[PDB]
């Protein structure tokens, strides 16, 4: 069984009228939910406008994220994988001198739609420095990427991290 933390989606931007039941009926369309909670004030019971859903598998999380935008009880909500910032860009290190743009594209396009690939070169000599930046159109690509233990591109074991503004 995959760790529960990797099967969880934070759902922001809820309608205050959304309930455990209506959040569950929505997100059960994309998989089995082992948990589904709207967060509420402890005294007033008024919704705090966010909640969480937990799927049985990571593939179900993927299915739910691929079905965005989600409109729940009339409001477009904002799902994100649980932490284990929200950015669209990664640093990729360890690619040495023989990794080309197509190696990075062929691999990373399977995580999401790529907008920019920048293979870094030395400002003086033009030689490849062995790292690159990849910008995607959406943050879930990055969120999937950084929770993997390993990344192998063009036979190299790569170090990948979020890149920030
Ligand atoms: O030449 C470049 N340098 C840096 C880039 N990324 C942004 C960045 C910078 C520093 C720390 C984190 C992220 C880029 O795209 N191209």
156 and 110 within one domain: yes
Cβ 131 under 6 angstroms from ligand 1:
no
15 and 73 within one domain: yes
130 and 69 within one domain: no
Ligand 1, atom 15, residue with closest C-alpha:
133
Q: Looking at the 3D structure of the chain, how many domains does it have?
A: 2
65 is written with which tokens? 């994220």
Atom of ligand 1 nearest to the CA of 135: 15
Alpha carbon separation from 41 to 46, 47, 50 (Å, rounded): 5, 6, 11
Cβ 133 under 6 angstroms from ligand 1:
yes
Contacts of residue 81, Cβ cutoff 8 Å, sequence gap at least 6: 6, 8, 9, 10, 61, 65, 140, 143, 144, 147
Measured CA to CA, the distance from residue 134 to residue 117 in angstroms comes to: 5
Q: Does residue 148 sit in helix, strand or coil?
A: coil
Whether 64 and 55 have beta carbons less than 8 Å apart is answered as yes
Range of the domain at 26: 4-81
* Final residue before a domain boundary, out of 46, 63, 81: 81
In sequence order, the β-bridge partners of residue 79 are 11
94 and 74 within one domain: no
Resolution (Å) of this entry:
1.6
Phi and psi, residue 147, nearest 5°: -90, -10
Cβ 164 under 6 angstroms from ligand 1:
yes
138 is written with which tokens? 């959406």
DSSP 8-state assignment for residue 153: E
147 and 113 within one domain: yes
Instruction: Please report, for the domain that includes residue 93, its CATH number.
Output: 3.30.70.330
Q: Which residue has the tokens 């948990």?
A: 35
């Amino acid at each position: 069984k995959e760790p529960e933390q990797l099967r969880k989606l934070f759902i922001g931007g809820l309608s205050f009228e959304t309930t455990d039941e209506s959040l569950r009926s929505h997100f059960e369309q994309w998989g089995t939910l082992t948990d589904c909670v709207v967060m509420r004030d402890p005294n007033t019971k008024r919704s705090r406008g966010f909640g969480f859903v937990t799927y049985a598998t990571v593939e179900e999380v993927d299915a739910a994220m691929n079905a965005r935008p989600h409109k729940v009880d009339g409001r477009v909500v904002e799902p994100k994988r649980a932490v284990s910032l929200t950015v669209k860009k990664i640093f990729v290190g360890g690619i040495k001198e023989d990794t080309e743009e197509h190696h990075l594209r062929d691999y990373f396009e399977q995580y999401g739609k790529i907008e920019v690939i920048e293979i870094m070169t030395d400002r003086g000599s033009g030689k490849k420095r062995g790292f690159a930046f990849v910008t995607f159109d959406d943050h879930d690509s990055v969120d999937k990427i950084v929770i993997q233990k390993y990344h192998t591109v063009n036979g190299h074991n790569c170090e990948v991290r979020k890149a920030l503004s």
